Symmetry: C4
Subunit: 131 residues, 4 copies
Amino acid sequence: AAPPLRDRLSFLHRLPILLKGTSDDDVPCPGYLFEEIAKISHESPGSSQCLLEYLLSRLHSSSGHGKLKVLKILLYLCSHGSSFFLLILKRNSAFIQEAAAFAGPPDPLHGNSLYQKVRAAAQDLGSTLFS
Amino acid sequence: AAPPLRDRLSFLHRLPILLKGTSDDDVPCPGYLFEEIAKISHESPGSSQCLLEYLLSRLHSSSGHGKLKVLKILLYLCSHGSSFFLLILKRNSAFIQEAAAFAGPPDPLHGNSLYQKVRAAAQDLGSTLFS
Amino acid sequence: AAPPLRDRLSFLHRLPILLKGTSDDDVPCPGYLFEEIAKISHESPGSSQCLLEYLLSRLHSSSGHGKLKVLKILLYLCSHGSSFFLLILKRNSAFIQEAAAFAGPPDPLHGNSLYQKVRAAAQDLGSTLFS
Amino acid sequence: AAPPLRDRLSFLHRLPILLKGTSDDDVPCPGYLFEEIAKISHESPGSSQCLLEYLLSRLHSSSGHGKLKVLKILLYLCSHGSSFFLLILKRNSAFIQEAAAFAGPPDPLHGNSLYQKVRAAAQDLGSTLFS
């Protein structure tokens, strides 16, 4: 049930898209990359499996900037991703309450705004995915 | 046997409670949050599963300050949490000897007091949970 | 199906080879160590299992310098390693898209060149292994 | 087959011994603690399971100082620990080649001596355990 190698290779060729869309920085992700990422989820079930692995990996390893981007991407996929992608997202959704607990020391310039944005995005994702 | 999504969503709505109760800082957790957390454990078995995931995640990722809070919360749940919560806590109790081994460099102001507090709380939890 | 202990011990005796070949530094790996590592993969199936464990561990724990070396070694093994090694590499190939996502802050002297080299090596490995 | 809770509790009461024996510092472990740790392994199979969990956790989380202590303790247990402990150690022995790969930046005062000591202890453990 794991992705066939042909799907792993197709997905590798898509990584320029995803690298820009989830870059761990304060530059908002542009709209066209949301559209491209939803298109990736529809390529095949194996493409969707690879995409979930990738997005959850980025969510774990990124600072709040990249975490926020992943959570926004997942929220968009709730409305435009494939049915199979949303199924495996629901089956692997224990991460949402962890994203909703993201916290740390406040920034002298921005306070806790970034943490609050990440937690709010996780709450919105949970409300959408779980209702 | 994993939590249904309706329980994951209910639990998300409780996270303000838990975020304050386990905040990774030197401010003691107030009594009313112990009571609220025990109430969460009684909501449903799925709520208890989510709660265990959350508390063990906080125990792993926090400094000694948050570790101590989680261990005190778990000790309180030994006397006031649901039967199902204490069952799954007992089934997942290998972490206690790890908490009881918490150590690190001494603080110039407070010495090893924080490590000693964490280890003592883990020992008390083990004595309560395992007897 | 895990390696017998005799194979674990033989592999330990090979670690001087692998330690030099994957050292986490900017000194390129010399050609003779590629040859020696391919020879290790042919010693036995258990030797190949140990070798995969080792290379994937180094890939995870190293800076970009050691990551690049591991990815070059794996690419060489695609052309000269044992059939069993390439089978278990294919079965454990989810790491490739993670290596192909390697990124971080740019270097004032070298920019993003190291990240780009790692990602390019991961793409080449995927193209070779998955086609 | 996991340890009963009575064994988890007995083991908690032994942690003062193990905390001193594996302390992550440059003070050699005294001989009497080797003897006490071997005695712990003989208390019961569950005590041995807890002991393995503890020692492997310390091996993973410690600097080279604590890693070296754990590897010396395990070598001693090869000659004086219980039969059950050595069985489960052999079943969980993939860590040895990872310890035998321990490396890092050299120390201006001590060079690579610590890494070399850890790797040599891992090689000795493997030679003893695997032969």
